[PDB]
Design a protein around this ligand. Structure first.
Ligand SMILES: O=C(O)[C@H]1OC(=O)[C@H](O)[C@@H](O)[C@@H]1O
Ligand SMILES: O=C(O)[C@H]1OC(=O)[C@H](O)[C@@H](O)[C@@H]1O
Ligand SMILES: O=C(O)[C@H]1OC(=O)[C@H](O)[C@@H](O)[C@@H]1O
Ligand SMILES: [Cl-]
Ligand SMILES: [Cl-]
Ligand SMILES: [Cl-]
Lengths: 579, 579, 579
């Protein structure tokens, strides 16, 4: 049940493919007509072979869905579907006596309940974080039955809550993986530069199993590092290593082969090293002032606009951001699949990583907070060794209230207790305190390392001309980071620059908006909204939006709109200026 | 806002056809990103003509839906859809000064919010009862804008609640009608035999408007009845008329032309006269002992299985019940459209009329009770002059608890206060107190005129053989009425009589079940479940159920299964026996 | 092999329900990659149990379609589908040796190839006529396999050809029925009044089998008719019977029970008696001058607009025609299912019955002619005992050419050789010889008993005003019969009477058109186009047509448009005038 670090480097076997499925809007497979749990629900996966008896379902003859994937793009009937879909997989696995076996879900939105061979393994909430179950002693010989009850109903108390500006993609949205482990295994580990220290690698390792006291070697061959330690009675060891690694940058995204070997287990990784801090209004990477030439990205695929999960999806999306001139991507509004973060790391993109504490979260609900903090912990735990991540984001466009501030302050404190190195951010919002004077007056700012916020001057707030007659002031010397900006346009839809949703309007907006950006004191980064048009049930203009947010600089079909080249040109200028 | 009696006989103009629609799962047209109501939502029906400004919707270029109808069968994407769909209609109407105009909805499931020309008229809950709004002084010249926000999300506190065995058909499911009235009009009236009195017609009439004190004439030309009264200061008058009408029966469903004429209004109706009472275990129609040779029917169409609304739909369904040998139909589990009740009345079918107080209603919720009692009142108010209705049903398969009993007792008392003539029923459930001994031990029975209940011996409770080894006893001498019984089968699916869901199993079940029925003391009626296969999201056997309850004696494609003729044969015997 | 009269009255077993199907556009199940027919294709119906061998199909685990029905309305993917769909059904049947068994198809559009237990039974072309195969010797014990390859590709040489104004509904569109016969059975018979004779019933009976020479008795008990004859060695016998039947009329559609008994077979029927002839410009029914107050009707269902096949469908459609005031229905453009003709027979509608010799048939193709003549023969053979049919129509809107005239003259001669009683028609077209003067100048008229033609003054030919100013003349004294007229409208779409496709334009058109009809010399009948909106792939106005011909006086959803009441009022007047 605890998280497993670096699943892809383990002895893995995929369960992906096409699974049997039952769409169950009234949850008949779980509740009887008295609304009570009952024995003989769909978790038993009883093939309906003996028709002298009555049952009301049969996985064996029902329809398939692809796993991994959202269900919404797989059948017209499931486009809007919010509720329960049952998934069922049969598999065999020969597990040598003494070896251990874990079932890992990359993500399931939103609620997953999991059974193996009719026995409940457990339950998960949160649609974008991984979870696993040990099945070592539950695996049978011959056919095993895996049943997953997936529900994506929107809940007021959930994280996210009943309103958000993206599609409610339900299903087993990321790979399902069997992981074989030795009886005592390296479960988790951390290897990164010490805070603000180009010359000191620090880290720790955590074993799980009955043989917790072991010698461990941390091996970084290219650095001629070979450090041996011994774990304590809890299976834990730490280390400090003086070294001079070549530091990762967007221009040279250097990664090192890192090998961990205990007496009973071994795992290899690719890990880069960098320092990150603010100094006044400056963002310093490896002690050098940088500008975050960024773009925002949802976890949604080119062309068919389903939930992204593969290296293919990531490489295409990031290849567009590369052509745009970016050294930075904001992955909104939740943890993305690990392939996306890894491809950003290898290709040279700094990353903003976020949890979906989005809009009107139930700040007074203690279960809601525990959910948000669990997603925070899981986000950091999975990716703590990804040096390209420099900002953890704890919220996006949340309304001001005392309970909200308390909620978010506790998340910010928790984040810092988990990771003293990376910057803490959150998408705040702007105000126009007096005509023409724009600022960010949000008490949340005091808990953040950057003045990060969304603003839509020239789209939601005025026509494009308004960019020309506003200026920005901030009452603190922290780097200013505009985490969203921009406007909508349909690729191939042309007209006057005054006509909204034409490419020409969006282009004119970006020209005047960039001019405004150039006047902002302390500006250190921009991640305009957004790289690719994406699905949203709040975008209803027929033939223009058609259930897509159209603020992409690239269409959902991979076409660069006119405004793409306005931002590209400015990012080219910023690249030269920050050399 | 008060109900209008006999809408079809008024000066009516249809608004049916195809309306503009916006599917809005996150209710963006109603709530902003702070989850607050906002000015400029979709109720304003602003055509998106000026694209120099931003808006996120446009009825004028969006997709159509048919009105009336469920949305589920109209688009694959809407099959399972639970949530909000906006409907918009433009119309003109020339209303002579001084005349009044009402907007009548036959039904909208589940919640309707209605605007005219951007102004909210009001809101309705309950998916099967009519409601109207006066628009006399809101109608403009030229184009008028009617916007209806329809939501069919299942609510725990709603009536019905989050679980039921039929499809959640959302939409404007019955005709939308403009009704023109004189300035003071006959709004409501009642004309029926006095309780247990073949020779006394009683009734009342209710005017609405400023000229409430008027002479009124009740005219029944075939009976040579011409009774003149005067209304009181509240617009109310009553009457008692000694007369010898030919009494309505299933064999001779006699209706009389009834004309009401006040000084300012007039309306004609077709009304029949009959007495109905129990005497011990006997049901007496016009003092004659009858058997209710019935069949249950959902409000769902032949062939395409959408929500039924027209005389065409009713005539086809009732023509099947006629061929089956029925003199009675149970219209489950909610008030059906008025065309169905009228066609039953004209063709000669006694009727059981029901409200959807079904399964796990929230008995302790005072809003829930007020909803249930309002639906009860509206059900009786619409159809109080339909002499073929002899049973009002207040519940179906509700679990035993003190709060439930209090809830249902209040409904039963309310029903009797509204209608002293018709019988009060409810589908109770059976118990097997000792092996082979079946009875109905439910305290609700004390408040009902009949021992009405569902039982599924040979389908849910045992195989068909169990019918042969059980018997029934009842501790009170009230007529026994089995409101559901039977089993499932796919038309065209054949095999051994031991194989469930074959026609042969269903046939064998009905043979043994009818033999069991013939042994029941006090049996006075049966409405087996069901006439036609119907949609249910709780029926998941692939290729057999496919989201249909298969307990029809007729398939959803109009095909008579083998079991149809078993019940037909018994009903033929009962017809002879009760001559 | 030959047609069987009155299938419904035989010992029938339905094979309807849901069948396994395979969509096969490239006909992989029939042709190999050299485009050669191969054996081992899909007609073998080999369940794919042994996966150590290679096979490219499996009926056993493939998708279902309803039989009977078009495929087009059953799946979105099959909406436009033109090509091959394979259908498969398993059944058991116990046949006592000596008894015979036939497989009857009410209709399959367009080409059907049929196999039983892997052996080809034969082939049929023509989408609207029934066909039979004897399977007496091919029936096996246990599971029998019936496979039908159905193809509705449009062919230039087909009847109809590659262009027509209705949907290409493919599939097994009418019931599939097993018919058990004695070894020598009554295959066909004819019982009708002799030409122009109110007192002489003439007829013949045709036996089939090895004992064709038998005593036959024809009983009409209500008429006290008992006639015994003996068939010849060819199985044939004729009879002449003096009687005085009550003559069938639309107002009193009298039918008699007719019983035929041979030594080894017997069959009952319901048959009515009437005379029909022209007299100058008069049509006389039972010697009485009548007007054919008609409406045209396609074989398409109310509400969901699939292919009609059942008594339910027929009754709904014809109940609309009854309310419209019709005594006559034109069933276009092909033979309708037998339920429609029988319901028109019992409800009191005279019938025009037609074969799809429509538009640009290949007049020079000898196979095309034999196909048309076979459909003619089959149409008349099936319904020759339906006294409500008074017109056989051999064509609709065919271009004038010498070869077309020869083709149609041969059909007309064949029709007359098969039926000396009923009238011969065909939908001709009009022309404007001189400005403002319309007539029918088609040499086909010489071969018809009526001057029957389609005209669209006010819709295709001018605006509605043109109806007010044109005059008509005809150079022969045969009854004039307008077989189509009218215009399109969307129900619920209102505007100026000058705006085409509004109900008001259509209403204004019918008012002016009806007045035009009153001055057409010789007019004896009208069947306006059309009763119900119907599917056509030539009707592309979005939101108005949406792939429907909108010329219905009733919408596809059963709603009477304004123009319905214009024609109803004229038919009310004609009913009084012709009393
Ligand atoms: O409105 C928009 O387009 C975007 O604006 C925002 O500030 C939201 O954070 C983002 O999720 C929306 O998609
Ligand atoms: O289970 C069934 O088929 C039926 O049984 C019942 O008792 C319910 O009242 C009915 O709504 C269900 O459809
Ligand atoms: O154009 C029309 O609406 C109709 O006109 C005709 O003359 C055709 O015979 C008919 O099949 C078409 O549907
Ligand atoms: Cl947008
Ligand atoms: Cl069922
Ligand atoms: Cl049209």
């Amino acid at each position: 049940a605890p998280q497993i670090m670096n699943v892809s480097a383990r002895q893995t076997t995929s369960l992906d493919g096409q699974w049997k499925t039952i769409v169950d809007p009234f949850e008949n497979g779980y509740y009887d007509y008295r609304l009570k749990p009952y024995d003989g629900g769909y978790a038993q996966d009883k093939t309906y072979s003996d028709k002298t008896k009555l049952q009301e379902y049969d996985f064996e003859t029902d329809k398939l869905l692809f796993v991994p994937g959202d269900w919404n793009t797989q059948r017209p009937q499931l486009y809007y579907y919010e509720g329960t879909v049952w998934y069922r997989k049969h598999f065999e696995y020969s597990l040598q006596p003494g070896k251990r076996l874990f079932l890992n879900f990359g993500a399931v939105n939103y609620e997953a309940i999991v059974w193996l061979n009719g026995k409940r393994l457990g339950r998960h909430i949160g649609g974008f974080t991984p979870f696993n179950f040990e099945i070592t002693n539950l695996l049978k010989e011959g056919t095993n039955s895996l049943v997953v009850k997936v529900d994506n109903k929107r809940l007021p108390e959930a994280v996210p809550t009943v309103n958000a500006d993206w599609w409610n993609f339900g299903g087993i949205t990321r790979p399902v993986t069997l992981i074989e482990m030795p009886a005592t295994y390296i479960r988790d580990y951390y290897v990164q530069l010490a805070k603000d220290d180009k010359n000191m690698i620090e880290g720790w390792v955590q074993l799980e199993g009955s043989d917790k006291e072991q010698k461990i070697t941390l091996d970084i061959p290219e650095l001629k590092v070979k450090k041996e330690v011994t774990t304590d009675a809890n299976g834990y060891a730490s280390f400090l290593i003086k070294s001079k690694p070549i530091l990762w940058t967007p221009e040279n995204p250097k990664l090192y082969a890192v090998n961990l070997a205990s007496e009973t287990d071994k795992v290899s990784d690719e890990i880069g090293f960098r320092t990150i801090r603010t100094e006044g209004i400056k963002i310093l990477l490896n002690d050098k002032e940088i500008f975050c030439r960024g773009i925002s990205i949802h976890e949604e695929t080119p062309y068919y606009s389903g939930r992204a999960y593969s290296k293919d999806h990531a490489h295409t999306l990031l290849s567009w951001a590369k052509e745009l001139g970016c050294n930075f991507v904001r992955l909104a509004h939740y943890p993305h699949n690990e392939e996306m973060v890894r491809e950003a790391e290898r290709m040279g993109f700094l990353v903003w990583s976020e949890i979906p504490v989005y809009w009107t979260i139930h700040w007074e609900n203690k279960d809601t907070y525990q959910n948000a903090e669990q997603q925070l912990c899981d986000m950091i735990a999975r990716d703590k060794n990804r040096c390209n991540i420099i900002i953890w984001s704890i919220a996006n466009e949340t309304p001001h209230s005392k309970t909200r501030l308390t909620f978010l302050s506790n998340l910010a404190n928790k984040a810092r207790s988990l990771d003293s190195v990376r910057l803490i951010g959150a998408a705040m919002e702007k105000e126009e305190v007096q005509p023409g004077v724009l600022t960010v007056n949000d008490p949340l700012g005091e808990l953040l390392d950057i003045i990060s916020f969304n603003e839509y001057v020239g789209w939601y707030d005025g026509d494009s001309e308004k960019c020309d007659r506003v200026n920005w002031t901030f009452d603190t010397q922290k780097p200013v980071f505009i985490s969203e900006l921009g406007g909508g346009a349909l690729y191939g839809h042309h007209g006057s620059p005054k006509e909204r949703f034409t490419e020409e309007y969006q282009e004119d907006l970006y020209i005047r908006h960039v001019n405004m950006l150039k006047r902002i004191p302390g500006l250190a980064g921009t991640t305009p909204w957004i790289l690719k048009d994406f699905r949203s049930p709040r975008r209803h203009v027929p033939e223009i939006q058609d259930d897509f947010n159209r603020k992409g600089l690239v269409s959902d079909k991979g076409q660069k709109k006119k405004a793409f080249f306005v931002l590209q040109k400015w990012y080219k200028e910023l690249t030269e200026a920050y050399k």
